[PDB]
Amino acid sequence: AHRTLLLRLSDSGEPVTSCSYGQGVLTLPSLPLPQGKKLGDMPVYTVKLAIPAGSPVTRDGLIWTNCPPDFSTQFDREKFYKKIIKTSFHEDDHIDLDIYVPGTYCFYLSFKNDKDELETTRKFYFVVLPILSVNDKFIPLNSIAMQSVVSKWMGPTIKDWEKVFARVASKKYNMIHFTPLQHRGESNSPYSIYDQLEFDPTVFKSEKEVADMVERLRTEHNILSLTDIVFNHTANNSQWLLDHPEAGYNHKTSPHLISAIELDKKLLDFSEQMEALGYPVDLKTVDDLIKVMDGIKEHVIGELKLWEFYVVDVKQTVSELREKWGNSKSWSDDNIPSKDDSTNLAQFVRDNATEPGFGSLGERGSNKINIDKFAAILKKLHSEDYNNGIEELATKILNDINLPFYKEYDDDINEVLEQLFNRIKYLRIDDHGPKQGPITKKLPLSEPYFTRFKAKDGEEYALANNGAIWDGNPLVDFASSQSKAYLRREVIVWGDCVKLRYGKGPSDSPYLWERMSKYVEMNARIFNGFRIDNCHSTPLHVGQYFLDVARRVNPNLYVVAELFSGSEAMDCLFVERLGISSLIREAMQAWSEEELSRLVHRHGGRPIGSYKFVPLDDFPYPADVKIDEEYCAYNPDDHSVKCVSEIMIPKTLTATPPHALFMDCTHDNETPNQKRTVEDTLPNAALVAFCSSAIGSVYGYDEVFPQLLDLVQEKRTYSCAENTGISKVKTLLNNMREEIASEAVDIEDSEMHVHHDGQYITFHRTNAKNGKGWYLVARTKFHSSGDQMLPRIKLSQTKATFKAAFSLERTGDAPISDEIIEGIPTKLRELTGFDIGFDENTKETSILLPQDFPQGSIVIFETQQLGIDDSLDHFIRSGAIKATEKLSLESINYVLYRAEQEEYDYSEGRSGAYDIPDYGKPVYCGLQGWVSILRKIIFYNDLAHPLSNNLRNGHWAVDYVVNRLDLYKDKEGVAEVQEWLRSRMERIKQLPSYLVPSFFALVVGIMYGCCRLRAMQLMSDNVGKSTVFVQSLAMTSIQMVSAMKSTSILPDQNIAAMAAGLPHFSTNYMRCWGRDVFISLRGLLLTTGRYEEAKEHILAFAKTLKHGLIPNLLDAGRNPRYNARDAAWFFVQAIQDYVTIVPGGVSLLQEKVTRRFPLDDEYIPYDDPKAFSYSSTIEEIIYEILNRHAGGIKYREANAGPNLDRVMKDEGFNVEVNVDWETGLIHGGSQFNCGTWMDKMGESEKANSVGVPGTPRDGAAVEINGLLKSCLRFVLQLSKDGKFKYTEVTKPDGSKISLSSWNDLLQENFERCFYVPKNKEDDNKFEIDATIINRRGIYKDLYRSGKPYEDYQFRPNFTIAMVVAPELFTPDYAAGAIELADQVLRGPVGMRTLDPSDYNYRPYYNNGEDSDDFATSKGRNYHQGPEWVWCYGYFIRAYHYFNFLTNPKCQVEGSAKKLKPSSYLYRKLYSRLLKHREWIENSPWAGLAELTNKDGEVCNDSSPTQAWSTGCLLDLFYDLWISYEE
Amino acid sequence: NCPPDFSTQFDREKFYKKIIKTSFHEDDHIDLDIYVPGTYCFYLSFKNDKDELETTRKFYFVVLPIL
Ligand SMILES: OC[C@H]1O[C@H](O[C@H]2[C@H](O)[C@@H](O)[C@@H](O[C@H]3[C@H](O)[C@@H](O)[C@@H](O[C@H]4[C@H](O)[C@@H](O)[C@@H](O[C@H]5[C@H](O)[C@@H](O)[C@@H](O)O[C@@H]5CO)O[C@@H]4CO)O[C@@H]3CO)O[C@@H]2CO)[C@H](O)[C@@H](O)[C@@H]1O
Ligand SMILES: OC[C@H]1O[C@H](O[C@H]2[C@H](O)[C@@H](O)[C@@H](O)O[C@@H]2CO)[C@H](O)[C@@H](O)[C@@H]1O
Could you tell me which residue ranges the Glycogen debranching enzyme C-terminal domain spans (chain A) (predicted)? Predict the structure, then answer.
């Protein structure tokens, strides 16, 4: 059906963690194949790789992976296959990896670097677990019960072994771990394997003999089998070690150990003649201890030549100086240090005149000096004649060279004998190991560090034997040249075993790799898996190769490993590359009760009430996505991985901690009888069995054997005594886990709580799906530590049921037989007296233990959380899509957003946002306010967050989500969304309190994603198919477009009105601004597809025309202050954008509005019969704007006075506009007016700025004139097609000018007036006064301005003209001018409003400063430094256009021979949008800010989400889409 | 760069798509309807043996005027 997982990648190709589970591995969940399907009928899993659009990896990117393309192809570690990444600046690319067989798979990405070179990422691995079945019943990996049995203690017959099989089958173990069933070595230790390819001749005689026995275990007792596989060593008496001695490290293969060889055979030879002089041959005195140390000091150390292995032979080098003095005898460069600095001169010969391998160990005289270069230096430093003090000088230098080698020797020798008398002490003088036997040939004082033998070839070789250094990184081969452990005697050896020298591959040891390969695949044909002892000491490349050979034989190979590397990161890396399926954890390692509770806590599961993952505001919602319309397209027989909700966003693949196999006792650790007591066997195994993982035990733990069985010596056989000790309880524990294994699946599905009080340990296993759970109270018996009483156990909203209870008591000591390993007689008494009280009011269960509950006892309770059944998950994950069926792009605003000021409008100031105690209020009243807070909470499972605490303290926030929609119930689809929330929140309140936070965030997250998907479906294709960043930008359209009660765009009705920004531009007269609305109209309404909403805004604002201008402040239809010279031209530009984009957009021109003002610029009140009066067409409105400007405007603001503006002076109200008809430019404004987008009127009475504009833009502004040229071009081609009637324009005196002539006037004079030439020799043709100038190569910001220096200020306003009227700019002038803005005026998110090099530059805006500074006080800096985000949009829109025309590197051949931008340009565009994507990601408001202080500094006064901030970035994405993506 | 119909004007650099019907047996025939005399050219794009995009030369043909 659907076995697909989503693996999202970052911009650097690294996998993205969906949740924080800790250091882990991309493991895919172990699930059975579909009903009646084998390996190869279909892919086991499909990993959907998601690459971000426009990311640096997409540039000529390829996905490499060693995943075979089909089931027919075998797996190869180093054969990677190509996959092409479909590059796009809008749409992410998805690449499927079909996997047909479990194993280890990795992937890396290759791409074109920014240096046009090739670059490669890391290799990222992911493990597909094997499928474990016995006959035809699937065995979940976390329900494995493994019984480890040692071969040599099971009897001499195959049927005598099958007696042991029946015993462990009654205890209901489902897996048996075998110590290697091969022919054992001399010492008969199970791990010293004589021959790897031959089984034990005593029991088996063929491979089929063991294969039939293992298959018998499968069909008879329903038990799988696996063995140990030994890679690191082999027995010291293998006949192939004689035939092929190079398989281990010897004096030929590893020459550095020659020094350690001559020391090992110097001690076996010493211990054999030791007794002759032996003052303390075998004693236990303090004087005895020192006398053997003196014997070591004098009999071997003094007889080992002072060790020339380090020291250069002093006199034998001087002898080799006179011998050929007269050959190569000359040096050159003066870098030879003076003899005064003896240290520098001594090491200078070390770096220059030395033989290969200086410092390293090897042969006896391994460290040597190159004589021919040394004598050449001696002749250059002292004299060419030898007798001139060379014998003195050459010896002085060599002695100084050997000074560090001598101190390297004294530090080595001290560690040689300190390790000796500290090891001989414990071995002989019994501290904890009684073994003071007289030195024999079997047991000398020296442990054989090297196994000596005579081979074929003639030579007598000397291989060593592995072991373990006490402390040290296990990744360092103690036999390799990097370690000095065999020399300094820092190795605890195993004489039974012998080195296995693998190299970099099969080339260093051919026969060893071929033998181990055939040895691995032999056991792979028979058994179900392997066990690797000390896997951390086996090299990676060695373990990788052989485990892959095994998986080719047994595709369902189950790998266990005792892995204790340096850290958790190295443990995960070994699990990643080797394909380990389970890690061994030992419960006997816990020294105290608290360490056991912490060990059990690590492998028990997740906390109770843990948050569930949901796609939120960080996912793409493709409008064309498949949907489980009622979460019903699932069949239990398909065994498909489920999506999170009705939306079919597949299950995310995230790193999870590697699976654990918890062993209550292995075959190497001491018995509970030894480390603790025998009674602890019951509570220890119960705590382990309750963990949500695989469990196991060694044979004898359940049968309470007295002490740890010596794997080397002991020959006794396991007892056939049945049903001893815990055998009854393990049958219960394993049978109970079989009931749980049927439904428990992933990591979020099993929860846990563990408590430790004194000697008691509490375990509460809970299934998060149905609410069924187990409660374990286990009193541990580490020591007999007196009576302890456990307090009253309290379970909230839960009912408990007694299951079973036992006590383990000791009845004397164990028998002492020489034939049979018999355990300690124990009584298993069932317990009673447990009182389970249930309060029928508070629904609280209390549990009291009886006083007869001795240490070493347990009691298991079956428990069930109240309010949860099996049908709870389906009821929450269904119906939300049908509930959002009737939602509109307007109605989604009330479900998801609504600021507190917007909510006060509908609620008259009564409601607002829910206040979270000890935190604050969410940013929006809708679901977005919750999602913005919950995403970080769900990611970290922060159950201690103030919101998490409040959710389980009561149902206030639960009812708040449902009760909000009463304000907007009458709107389209909101009622059905509220009913889905009402029914689901009602069902949630019936749950336990501690489970409400996880379920509250799940219901809110599901409805949010359905509302966000519904939005992408209602929008256009370019938005509903793009990256999260583009869709997040598009959701700002829903944040701003809303219906209100205190304001609107129409004076007679209350309809949808685009707000300027939230929350400070949303209510009353502060909401609608004509300048802002039509700058954002193309991005928020046209790019998104809200064509009808864009028409309503154009028509409504057209009604409020006056003075041939559009009002800055639109109060619906009453008092619309006309303080704007900028607004009317952005308005007429939005009309062109409407007609250009909307199909049949020319119909807007003939739309009849009811112009609420007379043609003559007068003043009619709201209630006036002359308000409706006449009708106006958009054709007429556009012409009225063009001709009124040309004909000369003349007006003073109506109702001027303190009532209008409390700061504007009287002369400021009379602002005017006229067209200079020699240039075509539209000038206008005064130094007392602020009629541009930089609208800041001073209001500081302490700085004396009241009424003084901070940025008065009087004269010709680049924005106004650029929009004028675009409007003229639009109406010219409009008449050429027959859509515009008017073609004449009258000038103030009375003459007529054709509209074409006005367009030609600007075309011929715009660049001449504004452009500042970069060379001073061209200043004579561009109307420039060079005395007042800042930088050259700049398009001016103003023309004929009141302040002449403000004319030449570098401001981002010229880019608006570059976007709307590119014909006014010669390409090379515009490209160089906009490159200056990129280096100087471009901030990280916002565009610097003023050149930082200017003297008026104050980039910090703090409206509320009461100082005497003419700028900082009362926020006059508004547009004099601060970085605005919308100007960034117009900047990059023209940065892309003019770099595409100028720079030849920004162009590449396209289909149909249309010039398309290069990846070099897309790379530069993508980089300049990273800060915007980070901003909208990590902001509580799901948008982009209005303003930013200097260099990205957050401005508190800035509105956190602004309409035209995100709308101008959507303009760029639509530009690249509508022009190239065809 | 042949216009699709007589209403569409001629552009030197605006080329139009035509799909080649691949077959191992049958050749494909693609018609180029010309409505006005002038200079017309055609080139072919295809998937290279390197799985890349490759283009042939521009091949011109002249339709003489009617006098
Ligand atoms: O209903 C009648 C109406 O009459 C009066 O309205 C006028 C104001 O008195 C008058 O000052 C003016 O308001 C203008 C202002 O002159 C102009 O410079 C501009 O102001 C900036 C602010 O300087 C700036 O700080 C910022 O204000 C934000 C602030 O940063 C933010 O942190 C938060 O506090 O919200 C503030 C806005 O509420 O941005 C603005 C806007 O760019 O624009 C102002 C609005 O046009 O002209 C008004 C014309 O009606 C009375 O004063 C008013 O109370 C009456 O309701
Ligand atoms: O010239 C006054 C005008 O420009 C200043 O900028 C430059 C100036 O253009 C240079 O000639 C020289 O004087 O360095 C000045 C910067 O220190 C001021 O920045 C500007 O505010 C002023 O109006």
Answer: 1036-1514
Inter-axis angle of helices A1507-1524 and A1028-1040, to 10 degrees?
130
CA A899 / ligand 1 centre spacing (Å)? 20
Residue among A84, A1453, A1457 whose CB faces B13 most closely: A1457
> Which residues, in sequence order, are CB contacts of A908 under 8 Å at separation 6+?
none
User: CB A1456 to CB B16 under 8 A?
Assistant: yes
The Cα A1319–Cα A210 span in angstroms is: 93
The full length of chain A comes to 1526
Report the alpha-carbon distance of residue A547 to residue A187 in Å, rounded. Answer: 28
What resolution (Å)? 3.1
**SS3 label, residue A695:** strand
Residues 6 or more apart in contact with residue A801 via CB below 8 angstroms = A836, A861, A862, A863, A864
**A1490 alpha carbon, closest ligand:** 1
Chain B residues whose CB is inside 8 A of the A1453 CB are: 55
Dist CA A724 CA A702 (whole Å): 7
Contacts of A84 in chain B (CB under 8 A): 51
Tokens 């833009």: give the residue. Answer: A1257
- Long-range contacts from A1136-1141, C-beta under 8 angstroms, 24+ separation: A1136/A1270, A1136/A1271, A1136/A1274, A1137/A1081, A1137/A1082, A1137/A1086, A1138/A1081, A1138/A1086, A1138/A1094, A1138/A1095, A1138/A1098, A1139/A1274, A1139/A1278, A1141/A1082, A1141/A1086, A1141/A1091
Spell out which residues of chain A touch residue B16, defining contact as CB-CB under 8 Å.
Answer: 1456
CA A182 to chain centre: 45
Q: Which residue of B has its CA nearest to A84?
A: B51
Q: Method of determination?
A: X-ray
Contact B45 A1455 (CB under 8 A): yes
* CA atoms of A203 and A201, how far apart (whole Å): 6
Report strand pairing: A1315-1316 vs A1296-1298.
unpaired
A245 preceded by a cis bond (ω within 30 of 0) = no
Q: Residue A932 CA to chain centroid, in angstroms?
A: 19
Cβ-contact A152, A717 below 8 angstroms: no
- Coil/strand/helix, residue A1333: coil
What are the C-alpha distances in Å from A1419 to residues A1247, A1497, A1509?
A: 11, 16, 20
| B48 reaches A (C-beta below 8 A) | no
CA dist., res. A1233 & res. A1209, Å (int): 9
Separation of alpha carbons A551 and A521, rounded Å = 9
Least CB-CB distance to B17: which of A84, A1453, A1456? A1456
Ligand 2 atom showing the smallest separation from residue A1399 Cα: 21
Residue A1526 contacts B where some CB pair is shorter than 8 Å: no
Sequential DSSP letters for A561-617: E----SSHHHHHHHHHHH---EEEEESTT--SHHHHHHHHHHTT-EETTPPPP---T
CA angle B37, B42, B47 (to 5 degrees): 165
Return the number of other C-beta atoms located less than 10 Å from residue A480's C-beta: 13
Q: Which of A84, A1453, A1456 sits opposite B15 (nearest CB)?
A: A1456
Q: Residue A167 and residue A935: Cα distance in Å, rounded?
A: 52
- How far from A1314 is each of A36, A1344, A1369, CA to CA, in Å? 78, 10, 10
For residue A1069, how far is its CA from the centre of ligand 1 (angstroms)? Answer: 10
Mutate to test the interface with A, among B42, B45, B54, B57 (most CBs of A within 10 A): B45
**Span from the CA of A1398 to the centroid of ligand 2 (angstroms):** 6
CA nearest neighbour of A1394 among A1361, A1430, A1355, A1340: A1355
- CB contact at 8 A, A1315 and A1340: yes
